[PDB]
Amino acid sequence: HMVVWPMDRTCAWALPEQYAEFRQRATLVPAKVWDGSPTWLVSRYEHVRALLVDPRVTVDPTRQPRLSEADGDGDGFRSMLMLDPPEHTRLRRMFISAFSVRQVETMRPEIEKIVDGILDRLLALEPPVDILTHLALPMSTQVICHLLGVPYEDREFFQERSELASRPNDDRSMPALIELVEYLDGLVRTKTAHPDTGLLGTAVTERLLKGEITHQELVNNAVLLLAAGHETSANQVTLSVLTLLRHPETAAELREQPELMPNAVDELLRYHSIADGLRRAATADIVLGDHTIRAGDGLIILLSSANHDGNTFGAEATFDIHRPARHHVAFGYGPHQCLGQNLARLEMEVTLGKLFRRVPALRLAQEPDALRVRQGSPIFGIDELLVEW
């Protein structure tokens, strides 16, 4: 225990200075955590990847070192994201085909129509406008509600609850988590009696009414699909508008060459690495070069630091939309690698694409060293991003 964890980011785009020294090392950095349990931080691309696919690393919440007084296992609440193979595998198998490349590519039309209407609505407003509230959150939310069949009318309730649920060191995360489960509990009971199409109702029909999945399991993974599905993209899109605004050439080059967008999106994902500080524990000894991780040791997986690893990515702190960037780990790696990632990328490609095609002189409406940054959550972002045109 040298540096304390959790560490919060301080800048909308800078990673913490410490991370780069962490990578210059021969060991893993030890960290002091609320419960005094042995815990390493993991900073190198080589390492992050090795451990995330290793079979002796667990997500079991009871093995993770406790990071605060409010941090806990959630009273037996488990999504697939909190299970190891083979139980993990059974649950992810039921949801996977909805998310394949070619399957996700069939939603492009509905995503385009969706973002079209948000932009019409947004451009009707007197600027300056906030991107998170008027572009990023509306699209991620509508898109996830369409895929899942969750009512958009409910979005104020589940948005605010997801935000709070995803703060594991905050008092309010438990009641919000309880309420979200309760909301999906009612929704799944409804869909059970009246299956719709859309991912939840299709799983009622094919898995739940066929004996492949229980009621609590569907409910729990529905919380996960709902919250992951909007809160993440919302922040990635917001931060990305900032970054493109911060590098004007990039906005205009994309606007003038859309075939450059997919790699640009991957570069935005790498650069910001908004999902960070993943929690794992060793279940057996694990040899990583010089260092021997011991049965029971906690691990804090820094996707961001690995995405900014100099030994893998040249000029790591630079935003560069021409570096092949497909091999970043913004969506993790290994069994739990983001089930949504093709949907995330499509959403971004269409949202950023249409926004700068339409508001081609979009400008920052505030100075980007007065941005509030989100702290205390494994999903980074900024509270607000004001723009003019």
Ligand X SMILES: CC[C@H]1OC(=O)/C=C/[C@H](C)[C@@H](O[C@@H]2O[C@H](C)C[C@H](N(C)C)[C@H]2O)[C@@H](C)C[C@@H](C)[C@H](O)/C=C/C=C/[C@@H]1C
User: Where is the binding site for heme, in residues?
Assistant: 88, 92, 280, 336, 338
Q: How far apart are CA 381 and CA 374, in angstroms?
A: 5
Contact 15, 47 (CB under 8 A): no
Question: Which residue lies nearer to ligand HEM by CB, 36 or 56?
Answer: 56
Q: Considering only 64-72, 97-105, 116-124, 208-216, which stretch makes contact with ligand X by CB under 6 A? A: 64-72
Q: Does 150 bind ligand HEM (CB under 6 A)?
A: no
Closest distance to ligand HEM from the beta carbon of 376 (Å): 17
Residues comprising the binding site?
A: 88, 92, 280, 336, 338
Task: Compute CA distances 67 → 38, 129, 164, 177, 280, whole Å.
Answer: 12, 37, 16, 18, 13
Q: Does 81 bind ligand HEM (CB under 6 A)?
A: yes
Q: Burial, 370: exposed, middle or buried (Cβ in 10 Å; 0-12, 13-18, 19+)?
A: exposed
Q: Does 64 bind ligand X (CB under 6 A)?
A: no
Q: Does 236 bind ligand HEM (CB under 6 A)?
A: yes
Q: How far apart are CA 81 and CA 229, in angstroms?
A: 13
- With tokens 């961001």, the residue in question is 304
Which DSSP symbol is given to 55?
T
Task: Compute CA distances 344 → 37, 70, 93, 108, 332, whole Å.
Answer: 35, 30, 19, 12, 13
Q: Considering only 9-17, 178-186, 221-229, 318-326, which stretch makes contact with ligand HEM by CB under 6 A? A: 221-229
Residue 343 near which of ligand HEM, ligand X, none (CB within 5-8 Å, type-dependent):
ligand HEM
Q: Does 275 bind ligand X (CB under 6 A)?
A: yes
Q: Print the binding letters for residues 194-233 with ligand X: x by CB under 6 A, - otherwise.
A: -----------------------------xx--xx---x-
Q: How far apart are CA 308 and CA 75, in angstroms?
A: 36
Q: Does 298 bind ligand HEM (CB under 6 A)?
A: no
Q: How far apart are CA 217 and CA 222, in angstroms?
A: 8
What φ, ψ does residue 192 adopt, rounded to 5°? -65, -45
Number of residues interacting with ligand X: please give it, by CB under 6 A. Answer: 26
Q: Of these, 64, 141, 162, 304, which contacts ligand X (CB under 6 A)?
A: 162
Which DSSP symbol is given to 96?
G
Q: Does 356 bind ligand HEM (CB under 6 A)?
A: no
Where on the chain is the footprint of ligand HEM (CB under 6 A)? 80-81, 92, 224-225, 228-229, 232-233, 236, 274-275, 278, 330-332, 336, 338-340, 343-344
Interface contacts to ligand X, rule CB under 6 A? 61, 70-74, 77, 79, 81, 162, 165-168, 173-174, 177, 180, 223-224, 227-228, 232, 275, 378-379
